[PDB]
Design a protein around this ligand. Sequence first.
Ligand SMILES: [Mg+2]
Length: 210
Amino acid sequence: EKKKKLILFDFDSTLVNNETIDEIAREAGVEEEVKKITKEAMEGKLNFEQSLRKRVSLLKDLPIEKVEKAIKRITPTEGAEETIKELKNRGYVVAVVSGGFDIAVNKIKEKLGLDYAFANRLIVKDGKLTGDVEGEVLKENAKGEILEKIAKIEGINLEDTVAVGDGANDISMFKKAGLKIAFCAKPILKEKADICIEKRDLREILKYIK
Ligand SMILES: [Mg+2]
């Protein structure tokens, strides 16, 4: 026998190298403005939901074909698939929980073979973004609520959970997690982490997890 563990990964800047919202902002012509808000939000200087709605509103009217062009530029972080496969090899459950968007996160869930995926969604009308976003990964304690929910479904004690992220919206996930790993993270999350990894290779987390 042997117990399973549950590992939750943030998406933007953690499982992938990019910030989905910033990539889309480039196609919408508001890259500078959105990048600045994203940085403040991930450093913990802004309420997450308010900052995300402010950024998504700047994307109003962008055609879906341009959103896809931005998504195409997203690349997986070094070692991502190998790390996920090794965790699954141990019999562990793996999830991605993101303040980003299904249109990007759906793909990685299937590509890397994840068991769960939670993200927000961009609202679309007549083939263009309306500027609205909706979802359950918006409130300040959203990720922690999701970690608890998944752990309950799987019968896994919170002490056997691991959270891996880079930004301030990963703090609520860290609060409930058994092991807190800040991956090439912002100072506000590093302060709360058990382990800080600065080499950009997800395989580095494996050493800390039995
Ligand atoms: Mg992130």
